[PDB]
Amino acid sequence: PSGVEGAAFQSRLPHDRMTSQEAACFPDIISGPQQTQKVFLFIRNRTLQLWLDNPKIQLTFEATLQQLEAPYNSDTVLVHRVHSYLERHGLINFGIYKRIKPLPTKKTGKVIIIGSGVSGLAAARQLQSFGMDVTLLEARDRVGGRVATFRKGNYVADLGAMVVTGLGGNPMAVVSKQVNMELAKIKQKCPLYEANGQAVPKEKDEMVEQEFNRLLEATSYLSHQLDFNVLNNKPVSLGQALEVVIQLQEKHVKDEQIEHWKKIVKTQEELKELLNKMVNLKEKIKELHQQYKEASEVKPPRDITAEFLVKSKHRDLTALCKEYDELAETQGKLEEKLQELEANPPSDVYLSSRDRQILDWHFANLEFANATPLSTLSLKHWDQDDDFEFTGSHLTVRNGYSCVPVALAEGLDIKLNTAVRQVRYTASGCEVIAVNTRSTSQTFIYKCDAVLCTLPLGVLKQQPPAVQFVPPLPEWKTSAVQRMGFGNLNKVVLCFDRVFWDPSVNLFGHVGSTTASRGELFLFWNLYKAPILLALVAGEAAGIMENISDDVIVGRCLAILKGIFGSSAVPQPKETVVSRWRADPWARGSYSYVAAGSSGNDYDLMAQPITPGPSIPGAPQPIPRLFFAGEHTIRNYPATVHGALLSGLREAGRIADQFLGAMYTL
Amino acid sequence: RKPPKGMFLSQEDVEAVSANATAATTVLRQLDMELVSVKRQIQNIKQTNSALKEKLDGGIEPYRLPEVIQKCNARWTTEEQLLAVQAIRKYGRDFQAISDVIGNKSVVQVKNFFVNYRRRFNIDEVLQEWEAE
């Protein structure tokens, strides 16, 4: 899409409808006349287009009104109202831009942010952008959180996020123009290589994949058209539904052989009855012939009865010879039918072990996408974010993704090595209680108007708690934390002194021996300038490889490569790194998933802020003080970076609205 | 509205593979038995029909009789008249047989016969005794 309408699409907004967001701030316009709505909608799209067309410089209200034309620029307050709404919610002037108007010397309001993850940073940025006092508390000695980047010498490899899922309407597209990112496309071609070490031949490779994609749809049909969503009280998982489909396909393969062979018996046995007439008729023919012989052996001249006997017997034998010929006619048809059925047999199996093992690799990929055993994904909801997919090639970051958090952290008050242990929030303010990660006796108290919490869902999940909330988080919040899924997926970094793989292939798979080990080193990436191969550990295997030394893991990786490339061309690796994200206590996992019995609604619960009780009974309802952001709070775009970023932009919006006032809604 | 093409998913079938833990293995095992059950039942009729097939060795080639190609005449030699009455007695009203016995009388010379010589040959009696057997 292009025009002013390309800006709406690139801003994740319908170009010709007001969003629910916008009805909230402009309820005059959306309840008003259709003409007004279109004027508004244009002003919205046009300003977005301006910001988009150049996102390294702030878009001031003046700059906007300048470049609007009548009748669109006839109404200044509509244009002012609209520009501020976009600015507050991070739709324009977000990320890294040169400010025209420098920051107000004195800031109003003070906010603590827990975590300098990408969501943290992005809100910090926006709050400071809005003239607020913003201090971030990071447990790690580095920013970026789950966006981590290994750097040693010329080697560079993300241990954390590494792909940008398409720039169609993706904020990272702005951030990239925004700060140099070496973005390179990811060539879709992935050869598989069985345990033996040889390529799956292309014919099998497409007919397994197609069966995979076909099985997936099958579950979706079980879910939406047969309502197979709850079984024995527990909700059904995707893995369950896949088994019920594979079983019902193995069922059908058998019902199909049975009713085929059962056509053979039903014809073999027509032949049984046909041969019994024919063997009992060759016997009557054997007898009359004897009789007719005996009758024509009474030499003539004879009386007429004795003459009739020869003729009558001759007729009879001719009658029974007609019958026996008509029946070896019929015997020919049935004999031909049996060769037909015994030569077009239906299929022997549903899938063989070679096919099923390959399919298991396609399941390993899906456990990779969702960072969890398919047995835990919600059948009804695992793919509810699939409508909001961006458009375009997926990319990698060849200089490392750390470049983006570091970029964002420029100018922000970041206290590194600072483990928050108690969040304490009351009708009159909050105090956050942290320690120093190095000597943990040394204690820190932070007072603030509001706490924005970007603690990983896995951290929020710890029992017993890594962070105490005082007072406790309400049940509606803590139940949402249990229901939600926080999964795991680790990776291994392999640094060699020479390229020994196909350099025109970005990624190539490895097929596992078992279903149980389908995730174990199932996939490798050539992504970087330097000779670095990067190897995934997904599914049930991820959580088990965290209990196994780096050498053992690296040793297994070499063996798989040896198989595919030969022992001669795969030398021992100069530098090796293995991630342990479930182990890491500042993450306790890799990212969220829609667990069975959860829904996208839990993602919205995670984002509702908390408003504490009145200090003095009878005092009026207080302001909200505890806010949440991060990858697990954006229901439409979970378990990503752009989604983390978006949630940070979001809360920064609603927090400013809270303590700074929303002058755009009149 | 409908499954992917080829994927078989009856609603009825579904319940039957979920009704307990091992029900899915249990239903498949029966079918593996229903399959062996039919499969040797085949070799057993395949065996029985190979026996009945050998008893028909040689067909009926020795028992066949060459063809009387004889031109279908009009007059009724007393010989042919007498073959007729005896054929009526042993063949009822099946003229094709009576025509094939007499050998040179069309099936319609036979019917006419049935009325022309009706009273002289007591066909009513002859026919009613064909009815006796």
Residue-wise burial string across B54-65, b where 16 or more C-beta atoms lie within 10 A, e elsewhere? eebeeebeebee
Q: Same domain, yes or no, for A255 and A389?
A: no
Give the number of other Cβ atoms within 10 Å of residue A624's Cβ: 16
Q: Residue A555: how many CA atoms within 13 Å on its side-chain side? A: 5
Reference A199, options A502, A570, A569; nearest CA is A502
In A488-632 the beta strands, taken as DSSP E runs, fall at 490-495, 507-509, 523-526, 532-537, 575-578, 591-593, 626-628
Angle ∠(A222,A223,A224) on CA atoms, nearest 5: 105
Can you tell me the distance from the alpha carbon of A534 to that of A288, in angstroms, rounded to the nearest whole number?
90
B-chain residues near A250 (CB < 8 A): 28
Q: Give the span between the Cα atoms of A330 and B103, in whole angstroms.
A: 29
User: What is d(CA A119, CA A630) in angstroms, rounded to the nearest whole number?
Assistant: 5
Domain presence at residue A207? yes
| CA-CA-CA-CA dihedral for A430, A436, A437, A441, to nearest 10 | -110
Q: Do residues A216 and A169 both lie within one domain?
A: yes
AA identity, residue A167:
L
Shared domain check, A512 and A383: yes
Give A537's strand partners: A490
Supply the CATH number for residue A420's domain: 3.50.50.60
Annotated binding site of A for FAD: 119, 138, 140, 146, 162-163, 631, 640-641
CATH class (in words) of the domain with range B78-130: mainly alpha
Rounded to 5°, the CA angle A102-A103-A104 comes to 120
Please check whether residues A391 and A514 belong to one and the same domain. Answer: yes
Which tokens go with A329? 């006619």
Task: Compare CB distances from A228 to B14, B79, B101 and report the shortest one's residue.
Answer: B14
* C-alpha span between B47 and A450 (Å, rounded): 89
Nearest to A604 by CA among A189, A170, A20, A176: A20
Ordered by start, the domain boundaries in chain B are 11-54, 78-130
Angle at alpha carbon of residue A644, lines to A237 and A398, rounded to 5°: 100
Cβ of B9 within 8 Å of Cβ of A221? The answer is yes
The domain of A315 spans 249-341
Resolution in angstrom units: 3.3
Chain A residues 284-323 with CB within 8 Å of chain B: 285-286, 289, 292, 304-305, 307-308, 311-312, 314-315, 317-319, 321
Residue given tokens 């190095």 in the structure block: A438
Q: After which residues is chain B broken (C to N over 2.5 A)?
A: none
Beta bridge partner(s), residue A397: A183
Mark whether A27 and A71 lie in a shared domain.
yes
Q: 3-class SS at A531?
A: coil
- Whether cis (ω within 30° of 0) applies to the bond prior to A171 is no
A319/A426 same-domain check: no
As a whole number of angstroms, the distance between CA A648 and CA A628 comes to 9
Determine contact, residues A488/A371, Cβ cutoff 8 Å: yes
Look up the CATH number of the domain holding residue A507.
3.90.660.10
Phi-psi domain of A158 (left: phi exceeds 0; alpha: psi -120 through 50; beta: other): beta
- Considering the domain architecture, whether residues A210 and A268 belong to the same structural domain is answered as no
A410 and A473 together in one domain: yes
Assign residue A272 the CATH number of its domain. Answer: 1.10.287.80
A550 in any annotated domain = yes
Cα–Cα distances (Å) from A457 to A477, A486, B87, in that order, read 12, 7, 105
* SS3 state at A126: helix
Which residues of A participate in the annotated binding site? 119, 138, 140, 146, 162-163, 631, 640-641
A592 within some domain? no
Task: Supply the angle between the helices A76-88 and A641-659 in degrees, to the nearest 10.
Answer: 120
Q: Residue A284 corresponds to which tokens in the numbers above?
A: 């009557």
HSE, CB side, 13 Å, CA atoms: give it for residue A272.
14
What amino acid occupies position A422? Q
Q: How far is CA A348 from the centre of its chain?
A: 34
Q: How many domains does chain A have?
A: 4
SS3 label, residue A134: strand
What distance in Å separates the CA atoms of residue A412 and residue A420, rounded to the nearest whole number? 18
Is residue B29 less than 8 Å (CB to CB) from chain A?
no
Residues A499 and A571 placed together within one structural domain of the fold: yes
Closest CA to B94 of B132, B130, B124, B133: B130
Q: Same domain, yes or no, for A394 and A268?
A: no
Nearest to A626 by CA among A483, A468, A486: A468
Query: Considering the domain boundaries, does residue A59 fall inside one?
Result: yes
CA distances from A333 to A153, A339, A451, B42, B46 (A): 81, 10, 87, 19, 16
Phi, psi of A339 (to 5 degrees): -65, -40
Helix (H) or strand (E) holding A426: strand A418-426
| Nearest-10 crossing angle of helices B11-18, A238-296 | 110
How far from chain centre, in Å, is Cα A315?
Answer: 84
Give chain B's length: 133
| Residue A335 tokens, joined | 């004999």
- Do A277 and A409 belong together in one domain? no
Residues A27 and A57 in one domain: yes
